[PDB]
Scaffold this active site. Structure first.
Site, PDB file in Angstrom:
ATOM      1  N   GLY A 173      -6.081 -44.959 -24.801  1.00 31.20           N
ATOM      2  CA  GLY A 173      -4.988 -44.721 -23.881  1.00 31.20           C
ATOM      3  C   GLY A 173      -5.048 -43.316 -23.313  1.00 31.20           C
ATOM      4  N   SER A 174      -3.880 -42.803 -22.943  1.00 28.95           N
ATOM      5  CA  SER A 174      -3.803 -41.548 -22.197  1.00 28.95           C
ATOM      6  C   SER A 174      -4.413 -40.344 -22.923  1.00 28.95           C
ATOM      7  CB  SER A 174      -2.344 -41.251 -21.860  1.00 28.95           C
ATOM      8  OG  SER A 174      -1.841 -42.266 -21.025  1.00 28.95           O
ATOM      9  N   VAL A 175      -4.600 -40.401 -24.250  1.00 29.15           N
ATOM     10  CA  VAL A 175      -5.322 -39.303 -24.901  1.00 29.15           C
ATOM     11  C   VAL A 175      -6.721 -39.133 -24.289  1.00 29.15           C
ATOM     12  CG1 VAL A 175      -6.366 -38.628 -27.093  1.00 29.15           C
ATOM     13  CG2 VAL A 175      -4.011 -39.208 -27.017  1.00 29.15           C
TER      14      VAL A 175
END
Ligand code: CO
Ligand code: CO
Ligand code: CO
Length: 448
Positions: free
Chosen positions: A158-160
């Site tokens: 995801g956004s990491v």
């Protein structure tokens, strides 16, 4: 006739014993494996079989080093060597406990955490919830975690993952932290449509705000500037899709689709962290590159080996991998401070303000990634991996912390939401306090 090799022990970086053997009697003499810390680091350490050889973990994978070779009469017995880990037992014990009570409080299926030394990438703590106890029979512990998911169990970040896009647009001179952008609420890209997790018209997000607010549209617009080839290269340089060589059995390589195989929609998914998988160690390893002024050092858990006489051989250090310049790395560290910044007016608040620790330049990134529904071959709509990765601190990188929660119902602290940020807060703050590290202007995420 036979002269038995004495099994070597496993110890942490400060020689605190994790596994060691003592002599006992019963087939008359019989050696007993002691695990004084019980479940402590047993995801790494492993356990013993009935014959005194390794059953799983490092006891198994380093058995030859630890078991030595039996002598005879004349052939000298070669006693086992001692294995020195990069683990710090005090850090590991705190982290392992916090990981268990983040699992209890958040209601997640499982929780894991990795702490790396910022400069060397040495593994200072690696922990999962539900860790078995190798001082007890393995057959009683089918409800326990006996392996090491932090290296074996990949997930979609995801956004990491947006650290890759941030690193490429800055490294290639395509943007700067203060660039005011114009970010619509949705974009059509490579045949598909991508929305931000909140509805909004065109917003004047800065590049800093794109990552601080975790705008998918903003991330993809900036990634268009990079292009698929330079973006894929940076993925590879951050170490994704490749085993790290950390020295632990069962490491997964993860999965990054080679660029020559992308569909029309791959580039719309990879920069925001879907369509690829990585282990928690790889994920934390990405943030170690940025923490170490752009130089990725593949993580390692074996520090040295001590021969039966007492002479010590250090593990060979892996070679540096330049991912981005020191100037790029420092700029990305400062931008990611925006994720933890607070603003009561809301406009200049990031996604992870509870991850901040006042007095310190904490920097990190929050993540939410949909899991794939086993029965349809499609994404669940309300089943997520929650991720956080961060650096203590941006101006003085000492520790890199990576966290994943498998589908929690609540925050890691038990408050409503689905965030790993409070777990990072606890660990990073405790790490600063225990080393008595002592305590500028607010960052602009949104123009007018
Ligand atoms: Co002979
Ligand atoms: Co909810
Ligand atoms: Co606090």
């Amino acid at each position: 006739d036979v002269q038995p090799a004495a099994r070597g022990s496993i110890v942490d970086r400060n020689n605190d014993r994790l596994a060691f053997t003592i002599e006992a009697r019963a087939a008359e003499r019989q050696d007993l494996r002691q695990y004084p810390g019980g479940s402590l680091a047993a995801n790494v350490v492993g356990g013993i079989d009935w014959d005194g050889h390794g059953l799983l973990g490092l006891e198994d994978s380093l058995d030859a080093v630890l078991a030595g070779t039996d002598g005879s009469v004349r052939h000298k017995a070669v006693h086992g060597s001692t294995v020195v880990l990069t683990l710090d037992n005090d850090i590991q014990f705190y982290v392992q406990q916090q990981v268990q009570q983040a699992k209890n409080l958040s209601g997640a299926h499982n929780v894991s955490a990795v702490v790396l030394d910022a400069k060397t990438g040495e593994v200072l703590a690696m922990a999962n919830d539900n860790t078995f106890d190798p001082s007890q029979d393995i057959g009683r512990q089918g409800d326990k975690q006996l392996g090491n998911p932090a290296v074996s169990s990949p997930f979609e970040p995801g956004s990491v993952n947006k650290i890759v896009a941030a690193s490429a647009v800055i490294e290639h001179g395509l943007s700067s932290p203060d660039e005011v952008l114009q970010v619509p609420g949705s974009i059509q890209m490579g045949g598909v449509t991508v929305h931000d997790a909140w509805e909004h018209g065109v917003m004047p997000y800065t590049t800093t705000g794109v990552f601080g607010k975790s705008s998918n549209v903003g991330t993809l617009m900036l990634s268009q500037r990079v292009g698929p080839e330079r973006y894929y290269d940076m993925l590879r340089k951050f170490g994704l899709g490749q085993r790290t060589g950390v020295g632990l059995p069962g490491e997964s390589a993860g999965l990054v689709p080679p660029i020559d195989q992308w569909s029309g929609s791959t580039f719309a998914n990879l920069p925001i962290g879907q369509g690829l998988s990585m282990t928690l160690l790889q994920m934390t390893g990405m943030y170690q590159a940025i923490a170490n002024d752009g130089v990725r050092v593949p993580p390692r858990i074996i520090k040295a080996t001590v021969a039966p006489d007492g002479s010590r051989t250090e593990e060979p250090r892996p070679d540096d991998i330049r991912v981005v310049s020191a100037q790029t790395a420092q700029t990305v560290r400062q931008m990611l401070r925006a994720v933890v910044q607070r603003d009561p007016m809301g406009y200049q608040q990031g996604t992870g303000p509870t991850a901040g620790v006042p007095g310190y330049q904490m920097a990190g990134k929050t993540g939410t990634a949909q899991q794939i529904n086993p029965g349809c071959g499609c994404y669940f709509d309300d089943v997520y991996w929650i991720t956080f990765a961060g650096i203590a601190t941006a101006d003085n990188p000492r520790y890199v912390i990576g966290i994943m929660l498998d589908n929690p119902a609540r925050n890691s602290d038990g408050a409503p939401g689905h965030s790993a940020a409070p777990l990072f807060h606890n660990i990073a703050g405790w790490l600063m306090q225990r080393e008595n590290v002592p305590l500028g202007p607010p960052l602009v995420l949104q123009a007018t």
